[PDB]
Amino acid sequence: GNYNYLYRKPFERDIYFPLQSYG
Amino acid sequence: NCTFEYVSFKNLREFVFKNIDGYFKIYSKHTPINLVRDLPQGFSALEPLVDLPIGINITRFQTLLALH
Ligand SMILES: *[C@@H]1O[C@H](CO)[C@@H](O[C@@H]2O[C@H](CO)[C@@H](O)[C@H](O)[C@H]2NC(C)=O)[C@H](O)[C@H]1NC(C)=O
Numbered sequence: 001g002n003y004n005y006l007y008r009k010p011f012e013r014d015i016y017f018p019l020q021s022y023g
Numbered sequence: 024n025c026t027f028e029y030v031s032f033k034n035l036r037e038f039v040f041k042n043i044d045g046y047f048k049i050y051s052k053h054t055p056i057n058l059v060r061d062l063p064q065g066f067s068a069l070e071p072l073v074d075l076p077i078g079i080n081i082t083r084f085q086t087l088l089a090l091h
């Protein structure tokens with residue numbers, strides 16, 4: 001499987017902690 | 024990580040900075056003065072020079088000084 005794709009004001013960017021890989 | 028990158032007393036140099044919907048907007052003016060001590064009591068309007076699509080939650084700022 002692939003796990004390289006991940007999720008956590010308008011158009012703000014932000015590069016226990018909120019990291020969740022999709023499977 | 025220059026992930027966004029862009030390139031381009033006797034005078035008073037003025038600026039306005041604001042940050043709305045992910046756009047950081049810069050207005051400015053340069054004008055001559057005669058009160059060397061402080062801001063002049065007359066009137067002039069600043070005009071837009073830059074708009075940066077940078078998307079940052081800014082809450083603080085600092086300013087940069089040249090050292091010999
Ligand atoms: C923008 O950054 C500020 C911090 O400089 C964030 O403000 C804090 O938010 C938490 C809750 O998330 C509060 O407990 C703190 O008291 C806040 N501090 C200040 C100085 O306001 C703010 O949440 C960030 N906003 C976004 C949209 O990311």
Ligand SMILES: *[C@@H]1O[C@H](CO)[C@@H](O)[C@H](O)[C@H]1NC(C)=O
Binds near residue numbers: 015024
């Ligand atoms: C550049 O950003 C990535 C995350 O997108 C980070 O892992 C890396 O350490 C950053 N490097 C620099 C020099 O900013």
